[PDB]
Ligand binder design. Structure first.
Ligand code: CDL
Ligand code: CDL
Ligand code: PEE
Ligand code: PEE
Ligand code: PEE
Ligand code: 3PE
Ligand code: 3PE
Ligand code: ZMP
Lengths: 125, 87, 178, 165, 104, 67, 459, 174, 63, 128
């Protein structure tokens, strides 16, 4: 649900992003120097922790810490609130980065539409 | 589970319903009174009386049988026979 | 159930059956007792309005239109008493109904566990055997030469007899057998 | 698991009502049972609240997360709409059961045989009633995290299940 | 037999038959456990139209919701090591095409 | 305990069943209030939802249209 | 095999020399002893067969069939002594003699190592069966049933004799071992097509194939209880054993010639189940169920894979036991009310509870309920058919649904509901009948416990 | 345990982490493990000690049957029934041994899947390739022989495969 | 007393039989009981070899 | 007025809505009387046999005997090959067989063509 669905369906699907094909612009297009994401947990550490393949994202170190916390304080199932919050906050930051990627895709698409309209008008005139 | 029915209990309940009927005078109502010969009701009144008894005892009297029960004693005998009441 | 049916239903019988069915379905629609009382009185008002009608053709047409109205306005899921044919408790205790002929195949030890019951049962069996000839004779004396025109059965006309064809009616299994 | 708990309790309360009213199963003939039958009344109310997703009963820890995941997924639009309408209709028929069985005036036959004072019935419903309140919290907090949560979402989308309920 | 009267004293109460009366050719399928032809509150044609229309409308709307899915305004989820190339069973000898995710 | 059947009257109740029903309704409501007092994030959420309109083109890496 | 063959030929003089009241006791006891002795044949090998002599040999396919035959004889004696109380001593001994002769022919049939001796014995089984049917059957139609059975079988089997002697002239031998080791491909020619037809048509009639099956309801309904028990449990399995044996010399022509028979088998499986749904007679219902199961076995043999042969063997043994038990149950009901109509006697659960339990167990095995060997065989055949093609699953699933439907329909109709009011002679079940049902049903569950004993040589 | 061969049925070394409790609360699992060891493990161990003492007094041995090799169907002359019989029996025994080899490899695969757990797709790649190779060879040998399979039919299948491979090699070298 | 006789029979005898069957018969053959390997986290102590699994690198911690 | 009810074969017409129920002729009444007389005669016979103290066994039902006979043993004597019978028999007995033959033949031909062309996924297909 959301207004983006209304914009894409009852509107300009060419200006709205396509979730199954995003991104369509180069990651450095408009970013002069862009840094790669940092991964804390290593492949061997995630493999040892037996993280689910969908849980082996960039937040996996907080998940590993939460699992270790819950194992050690077993009878007290209410003792890993801080580890749970750290994992949840890392997931929140990852999600807002996904939202930023979507918004960048949207305004890049509409900038391309404006540029091509300007070129078309210049060619016509 | 539930207490068994008795002839006196069935009689009491049928006469109770009939005394709560407005078109029947409770003073001249007896267990042998006829609904139309000496109470002055009609067929629709008898239908409503039988339906009231059905609601009272929680079971249904088929139309073939209900059209003949013209007496509180007849109703008592019918219900006792259907419920296997002998005392 | 207990009464033998006739060849046809009279107009009055049809009207009364429609009255009862209509009141039951109205009660199914009108769940609450006060609302049911109100609309039941209105329904009886309609029946009493058409109560006095000499033209039987008009009376039959009124009944036909009332039946059509009922079929259109009937409750899809009318209330049924649990023990009634459509009910939830209908025929639940049929697997517990066993006959007395099934009773007499018992082993002698089993019958020895109930000495007093089986003495009374033997008395009942003797009573049944002593009356069968009188019952069949009474049945064949009172029938018309053509045959039985209805399913009704006569009572016992004498001080020592029993109503013909009584055994299974009298000894039918109890409504709550086990 | 959560549905096992509260649905079993709901069926047991329904059976208690049926038994106390001489094998009657029609809500049109039930009535007055709120005061007539206290313990089964409170048990059925707790179960129906847990079924509809009361914010901290045993049904909240599963149904609320299911609705959140459905709203936040790349799903069929018609499937999402039907799921939300079904949540509303769940609240609706739970209301129908309570309203027609427990509130109001009686409609059952005048011989009142209502009796829910058997220790077997009370203890069985009591055991399944504690679970319908606390078992969701215990189970949810003791199982390992087997899925990534939906930490960030709009407030209206967060409160969708409660609003439709 | 379902249409037969239930309040009558049949000889076979469960089958709703009397002794000696003619038996329908298809009694084997018209028993109360089998095909029922009793009248219904709604006409059969109306039942068919309503049922078929409901199911066809639901099928059409599921197809429509498939070609118009509902989603959230987010980009693809990102996974660390070439989208977890080795975790998903990729060949250790062969070198995957690198997948690089940048900050934003 | 033996409960005598009533005819056209409210059934006989028991102090034990009344107190048990009251105790368990109170237990449910205490639990709901206690959980809402502590874990209010489960109902109202925990992290704010970003507004994409407030993100600058400079931080989203969008160049000026003329450029 | 002589240690099993000679005791049967000694059952004969013992039967004729025992006293007038000890015939049933002697026959039953010594049949049980011979069954126990025949249990030793189940110790088979993994490489080859048990080559006893030049004339007889045993295999993983023959051994369970022999055990089933030897076990079925005493059960037939029990049912027979149920229904033959008023007979004279000479005629009782003649009935027991027919049963013993049939068992001897069946033993030598399953253990015969030559196709011609196998033919002679497998045709010799017709005479005792025909005599039993047309002499000790109850109704008028036993004569027509015997005619149908005899002439169907002979019309099927005479071209088989011609083909067998032709193959002996062509290759020099009809020994099964030699024709297995010296087999050659059958080229696609009209002569080879008609040789294939002769052999397969003999055994398809014996099976029976759908469309060649009318003799089966005729004979199984009109035969006495022992005749019904041996017709369904063992005599139907001569077709399966023969088809499994003789298809050694029929390849690769079986790949091309099996289409009509597979189509007939699958569609007729559906059709006979649907017939079972609407049968007014109990014995006819059980007979048509037998036809459906044998259709499945025919499919297994024709697709001819190692997984299909194991399923075919398992299904043949399981069907033998289950159908014999069902016939016995129906016969007890008939001996009560003297009618085969299914709706006449109802409420038999509230009149006879333990017989209701036996009915439940027999009907639960008739439909494939796991882990019964019925299901094991059906599932192996279904898997092999799935590898053959992927719409055989559609036909097989439809057949399983209809089988469950008619089995539970039979159970509900006979046992549940309310008893017929005027049937007042339902005496309590006899110890003999109860023991008969137990002896039918316990071996089936034990075979479930040890299933490799009935999976055939391909295991 | 010396019951089976660790080379045939390998298992990785078991790395069990040491407990690192961080609470004063007692461990119900530890208490129940102690109760289980007291009530169950000790009686069953005593019973097994008694039974094993009784077994050691009646020690006796059974041997594994050894089959020598015999000429195969390739060497057997046409319609030489005795050599054909010996070759057919030998081929049947080899077929059984190959079936059991495939069973062993499948057991390895299943055990590794369960043991690795949530990272089986990467950690069981060695067992998957071994199963693939063994199953492919077994299929190429005994794939479509039929219900009446024999050494002659398998020889014909192998001759057909060799002819096809020779033709493909000639076409490639052309 | 009733539940004491019930508990020893119904719980104790089956658990004895099953533990004997599993320890000495089932687990005497390869791959009969397969356990999922325990999870290992950074900063752990492997008991089998007295090993120490190292901790993770420093997190880019926020707040 | 009210919408009318359309009877079907599987949802028949109620007796209260049958137009003939409200048009009763004096011959209709005597037909009803004759039917009731037949039922009463049969009921009397059955009840006499049923209540006989000396009867042991099954009261044979001639109607049931006739039904079972008509369902099985009287069909072929009363069968004639007509155009309708011949066409229905040919269809229901031949059409399914050839339909299934075509389906399975086509499926197996496609499977064998893929096998020969060597582009059918047959890995791990050990059991056949
Ligand atoms: C050895 C045992 C048997 C084995 C048989 C195997 C095959 C052998 C074939 C030849 C047999 C020899 C001939 C016997 C003729 C008998 C005739 C007769 O009167 O029989 C009744 C007679 C006694 O009755 P009865 O006092 O004469 O009164 C007669 C009245 O009719 C009584 O009045 P009723 O009215 O009650 O009687 C009427 C009855 C009277 O009818 C009869 O008695 C007629 C019996 C059949 C006729 C003979 C057929 C011969 C042709 C060969 C096929 C025979 C198979 C059946 C053999 C039956 C043997 C009795 O007729 C019917 O009921 C009509 C029934 C019609 C259908 C059945 C008849 C046909 C069956 C055969 C056809 C099927 C063949 C299949 C193919 C395979 C063949 C192998 O039985 C005997 O005497 C028994 C004979 C055997 C005695 C034992 C011998 C051995 C002793 C011990 C040896 C130990 C050896 C060493 C062991 C080591 C330790 C020491
Ligand atoms: C066991 C035999 C079962 C069949 C015969 C039943 C006889 C009977 O009437 O029983 C009721 C009767 C109870 O008295 P009652 O209630 O008054 O009876 C009146 C009515 O009959 C009362 O009727 P009822 O309605 O109460 O009948 C109860 C029962 C009567 O019926 C049955 O019990 C039939 C059960 C089988 C159904 C048909 C076959 C289905 C496919 C499975 C086949 C393989 C099964 C497993 C292998 C079995 C190997 C033997 O039927 C049911 O409860 C319905 C069961 C429906 C199927 C259940 C679901 C399918 C099976 C799923 C599990 C399969 C196993 C593998 C699991 C894999 C993982 C571990 O039982 C007895 O009296 C038992 C005493 C006689 C037998 C035992 C003799 C003593 C010796 C025992 C030990 C022997 C070994 C030597 C030890 C030495 C130390
Ligand atoms: C009316 C039309 C009847 C059609 C159905 C046939 C049944 C009637 C039998 C009449 C014979 C039919 C012709 C049989 C074919 C034949 O004779 O030759 C087959 C072939 C040729 O031999 P050669 O002379 O050596 O050829 C060498 C070439 N250089 O010989 C053989 O292979 C032996 C085959 C035995 C013939 C079997 C007859 C085939 C009939 C099929 C059996 C189906 C009947 C089953 C009845 C089922 C109903 C209960
Ligand atoms: C662990 C296995 C051990 C089991 C050993 C069993 C050996 C036999 C024991 C059972 C035999 C039963 C009877 C034992 C003694 C008889 C008792 C008695 O006196 O009663 C007789 C019992 O008579 C009988 O019923 C006959 C049955 C006894 C003889 C049948 C058993 C012979 C079986 C021989 C077994 C050898 C087989 C081994 C070779 C295998 C062959 C394939 C009198 O009864 P009726 O004659 O019927 O009365 C009427 C007279 N007016
Ligand atoms: C979708 C299901 C289709 C099933 C298979 C497809 C086959 C075609 C459908 C049935 C056509 C005929 C098959 C056999 C049916 C026999 C016809 C019948 O039963 O009636 C015969 C009539 O048949 C004849 O005697 C003459 C033979 C031919 C007439 C019937 C066949 C005509 C079929 C029309 C051909 C198709 C039309 C094409 C239209 C466009 C379709 C794309 C007797 O008449 P009555 O006495 O009235 O008995 C009926 C009692 N109610
Ligand atoms: C409410 C009533 C809605 C009625 C909608 C009718 C169908 C609209 C339609 O066809 O839209 C065009 C296209 C989907 O059409 P398509 O499925 O490719 O094929 C049409 C031929 N049947 O739809 C589109 O191209 C939709 C564009 C967005 C696609 C999102 C991802 C899928
Ligand atoms: C009035 C007359 C009524 C007649 C009723 C007949 C019923 C239909 C029986 C057959 C049904 C399925 C037919 C399948 C079919 O036509 O198969 C053809 C089959 C394959 O041949 P083809 O496809 O050319 O293969 C070449 C390689 N690609 O070709 C073959 O396999 C070759 C020929 C095999 C069949 C020979 C004859 C046996 C026929 C089946 C058994 C007959 C007896 C049982 C049938 C019922 C009898 C009442
Ligand atoms: P008692 O013997 O006094 O009965 C008197 C009778 C009625 C028999 C008369 O003597 C009589 O015959 N009068 C003339 C015939 C007659 O009454 N005709 C009219 C009868 S039908 C009528 O007009 C009433 C119909 C109105 C109600 C229709 C019901 C439909 C509603 C169904 C709704 C169900 C869900 C709400």
């Amino acid at each position: 649900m959301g207004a983006h669905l209304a914009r894409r369906y009852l509107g300009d699907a060419s200006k709205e992003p396509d979730p199954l094909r995003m991104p369509t612009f180069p990651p450095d297009y408009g970013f002069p120097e862009r840094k790669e994401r940092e991964m804390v947990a290593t492949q061997q550490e995630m493999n040892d922790a037996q993280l689910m393949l969908q849980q082996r994202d960039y937040c996996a170190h907080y998940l590993i810490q939460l699992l270790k916390c819950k194992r050690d304080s077993f009878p007290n199932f209410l003792a890993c609130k801080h580890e749970q919050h750290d994992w949840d906050y890392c997931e929140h930051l990852d999600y807002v980065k996904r939202m930023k990627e979507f918004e960048r895709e949207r305004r890049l698409l509409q900038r391309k539409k404006r540029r091509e309209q300007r070129e078309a008008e210049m060619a016509r005139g | 589970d539930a207490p068994p029915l008795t002839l006196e209990a069935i009689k009491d309940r049928v006469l109770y319903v009939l005394k709560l009927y407005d078109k029947i005078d409770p003073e001249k109502l007896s267990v042998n009174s006829h609904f139309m010969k000496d109470l002055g009701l009609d067929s629709l009144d008898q239908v409503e009386i039988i339906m009231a008894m059905e609601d009272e005892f929680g079971f249904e009297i088929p139309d073939i049988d209900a059209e003949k029960l013209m007496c509180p004693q007849e109703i008592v005998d019918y219900i006792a026979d259907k419920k296997d009441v002998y005392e | 159930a207990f009464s033998a049916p006739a060849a046809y239903l009279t107009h009055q019988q049809k009207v009364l059956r429609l009255y009862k069915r209509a009141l039951r379905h109205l009660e199914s629609w009108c769940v609450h007792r006060d609302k049911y009382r109100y609309f039941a009185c209105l329904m009886r008002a309609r029946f009493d309005e058409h109560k006095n009608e000499k033209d039987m053709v008009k009376a039959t047409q009124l009944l036909r239109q009332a039946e059509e109205e009922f079929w259109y306005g009937q409750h899809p899921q009318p209330y049924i008493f649990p023990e009634s044919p459509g009910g939830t408790s209908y025929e639940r205790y049929e697997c517990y109904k066993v006959p007395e002929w099934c009773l007499d195949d018992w082993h002698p030890s089993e019958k020895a566990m109930y000495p007093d019951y089986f003495a009374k049962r033997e008395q009942w069996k003797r009573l049944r055997r002593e009356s069968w000839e009188r019952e069949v004779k009474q049945l064949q004396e009172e029938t018309p030469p053509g045959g039985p025109r209805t399913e009704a059965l006569p009572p016992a006309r004498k001080e020592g007899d029993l109503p013909p064809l009584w055994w299974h009616i009298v000894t039918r299994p109890r409504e709550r057998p086990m | 698991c959560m549905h096992a708990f509260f649905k079993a309790m709901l069926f047991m309360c329904s059976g208690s009502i049926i038994h106390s009213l001489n094998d009657e199963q029609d809500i049109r003939k039930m009535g007055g049972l709120y005061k007539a039958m206290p313990f089964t009344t409170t048990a059925l109310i707790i179960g129906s609240l847990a079924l509809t997703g009361m914010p901290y009963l045993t049904g909240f820890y599963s149904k609320d997360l299911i609705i959140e995941a459905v709203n936040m997924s790349y799903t069929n639009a018609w499937a999402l709409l039907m799921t939300l309408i079904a949540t509303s209709l769940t609240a609706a028929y739970s209301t129908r059961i309570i309203f027609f069985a427990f509130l109001g005036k009686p409609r059952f036959p005048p011989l009142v045989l209502i009796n829910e004072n058997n220790p077997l019935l009370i203890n069985s419903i009591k055991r399944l009633l504690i679970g319908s309140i606390f078992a969701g919290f215990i189970i949810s907090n003791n199982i390992p995290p087997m899925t990534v949560p939906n930490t960030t979402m709009p407030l209206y989308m967060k409160m969708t299940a409660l609003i439709v309920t | 037999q379902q249409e037969r009267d239930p309040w009558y004293d049949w000889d076979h109460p469960d089958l709703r038959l009397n002794w000696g009366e003619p038996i329908h050719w298809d009694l084997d399928m018209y028993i109360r456990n089998r095909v029922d032809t009793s009248p219904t509150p709604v006409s059969w044609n109306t039942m068919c139209k309503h049922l078929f229309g409901f199911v066809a409308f639901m099928l059409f709307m599921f197809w429509v919701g498939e070609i118009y899915p509902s989603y959230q305004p987010v980009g693809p989820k990102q996974y660390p090591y070439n989208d977890l190339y080795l975790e998903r069973g990729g060949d250790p000898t062969k070198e995957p095409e690198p997948v690089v995710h940048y900050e934003i | 305990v033996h409960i005598e059947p009533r005819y056209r009257q409210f059934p006989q109740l028991t102090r034990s069943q009344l107190i048990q029903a009251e105790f368990f309704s109170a237990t449910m409501w205490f639990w709901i209030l206690w959980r809402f007092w502590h874990d209010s994030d489960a109902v109202l959420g925990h992290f704010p939802y970003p507004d994409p309109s407030q993100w600058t083109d400079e931080e989203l890496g969008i160049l000026p249209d003329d450029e | 095999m002589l240690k099993i063959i000679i005791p049967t030929t000694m059952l004969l003089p013992m039967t004729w020399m025992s006293k007038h009241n000890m015939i049933w006791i002697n026959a039953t006891v010594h049949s049980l002893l011979i069954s126990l002795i025949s249990l030793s044949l189940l110790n088979q090998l993994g490489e080859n067969s048990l080559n006893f002599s030049l004339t007889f040999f045993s295999d993983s396919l023959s051994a369970p069939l022999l055990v089933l035959t030897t076990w079925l004889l005493p059960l037939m004696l029990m049912a027979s002594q149920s229904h033959l109380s008023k007979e004279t001593t000479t005629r009782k001994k003649l009935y027991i003699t027919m049963l013993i002769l049939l068992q001897l022919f069946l033993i030598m049939t399953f253990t015969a190592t030559e196709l011609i001796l196998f033919y002679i014995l497998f045709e010799a089984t017709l005479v005792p069966t025909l005599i039993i049917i047309t002499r000790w059957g109850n109704q008028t139609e036993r004569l027509n049933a015997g005619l149908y059975f005899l002439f169907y079988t002979l019309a099927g089997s005479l071209p088989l004799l011609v083909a067998l002697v032709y193959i002996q002239n062509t290759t020099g031998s009809l020994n099964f071992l030699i024709i297995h080791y010296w087999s050659h491909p059958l080229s696609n020619s009209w002569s080879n097509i008609f040789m294939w037809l002769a052999c397969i048509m003999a055994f398809m009639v014996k099976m029976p194939l759908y469309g060649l099956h009318l003799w089966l309801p005729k004979a199984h309904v009109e035969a006495p209880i022992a005749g019904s028990m041996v017709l369904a449990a063992v005599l139907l399995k001569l077709g399966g054993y023969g088809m499994m044996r003789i298809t050694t010399i029929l390849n690769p022509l079986t790949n091309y010639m099996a289409y009509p028979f597979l189509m007939l088998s699958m569609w007729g499986m559906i059709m006979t189940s649907s017939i079972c749904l609407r049968q007014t007679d109990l014995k006819s219902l059980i007979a048509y169920s037998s036809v459906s199961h044998m259709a499945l076995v025919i499919v297994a043999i024709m697709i001819q894979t190692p997984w299909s042969f194991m399923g075919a063997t398992a299904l043949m043994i399981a069907h033998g036991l289950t159908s014999s038990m069902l016939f016995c149950l129906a016969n007890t009901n008939y001996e009560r009310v003297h009618s085969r109509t299914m709706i006449l006697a109802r409420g038999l659960q509230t009149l006879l509870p333990l017989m209701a339990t036996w009915w439940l167990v027999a009907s639960l095995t008739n439909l494939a309920l796991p882990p019964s060997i019925n299901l094991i065989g059906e599932l192996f055949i279904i898997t092999a058919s799935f590898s053959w093609s992927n719409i055989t699953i559609i036909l097989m699933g439809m057949n399983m649904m209809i089988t469950a439907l008619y089995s539970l329909y039979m159970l509900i109709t006979t046992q549940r509901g309310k008893y017929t009011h005027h049937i007042n002679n339902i005496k309590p079940s006899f110890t003999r009948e109860n023991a008969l049902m137990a002896l039918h049903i316990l071996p089936l569950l034990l075979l479930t416990l040890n299933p490799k004993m009935i999976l055939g040589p391909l295991y | 345990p010396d019951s089976w061969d660790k080379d045939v049925y390998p298992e990785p070394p078991r790395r069990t982490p040491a407990p690192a409790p961080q609470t004063s609360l007692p461990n119900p699992v530890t208490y129940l493990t102690k109760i289980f060891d007291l009530l169950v493990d000790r009686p069953v161990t005593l019973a097994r000690e008694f039974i094993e003492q009784q077994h050691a007094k009646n020690r006796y041995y059974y041997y594994h049957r050894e089959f020598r090799r015999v000429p195969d169907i390739t060497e057997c002359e046409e319609k030489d029934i005795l050599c054909m019989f010996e070759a057919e029996m030998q081929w049947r025994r080899d077929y059984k041994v190959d079936q059991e080899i495939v069973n062993i490899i499948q057991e390895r695969l299943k055990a590794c899947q369960q043991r690795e757990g949530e990272s089986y797709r990467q950690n069981c790649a060695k067992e998957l390739e071994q199963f693939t190779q063994v199953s492919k060879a077994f299929q190429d040998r005994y794939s479509d022989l039929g219900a009446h399979y024999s050494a002659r039919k398998c020889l014909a299948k192998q001759k057909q495969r060799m002819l096809a491979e020779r033709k493909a090699a000639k076409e490639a070298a052309a | 007393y009733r539940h004491s006789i019930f508990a020893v029979t119904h719980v104790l005898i089956p658990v004895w039989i099953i533990h004997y069957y599993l320890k000495y018969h089932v687990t005497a053959k390869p791959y009969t009981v397969v356990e999922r390997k325990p999870r290992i986290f950074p900063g752990d102590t492997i008991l089998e070899t007295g090993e120490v699994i190292p901790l993770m690198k420093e997190f880019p911690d926020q707040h | 007025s009210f919408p009318k009810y359309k009877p079907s074969r599987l949802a028949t017409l109620p007796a209260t809505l049958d137009p003939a129920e409200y048009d009763i002729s004096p011959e209709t009444r005597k037909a009803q009387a004759e039917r009731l007389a037949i039922r009463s005669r049969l009921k009397r016979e059955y009840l006499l046999q049923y209540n006989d103290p000396n009867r042991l066994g099954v009261i044979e039902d001639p109607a049931l005997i006739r039904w079972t006979y008509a369902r099985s043993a009287n069909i072929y004597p009363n069968f004639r090959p007509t155009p309708k019978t011949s066409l229905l028999g040919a269809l229901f007995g031949i059409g399914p067989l050839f339909f299934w033959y075509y389906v399975f033949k086509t499926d197996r031909d496609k499977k064998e063509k893929l096998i020969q062309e060597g582009k059918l996924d047959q890995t791990f297909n050990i059991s056949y």
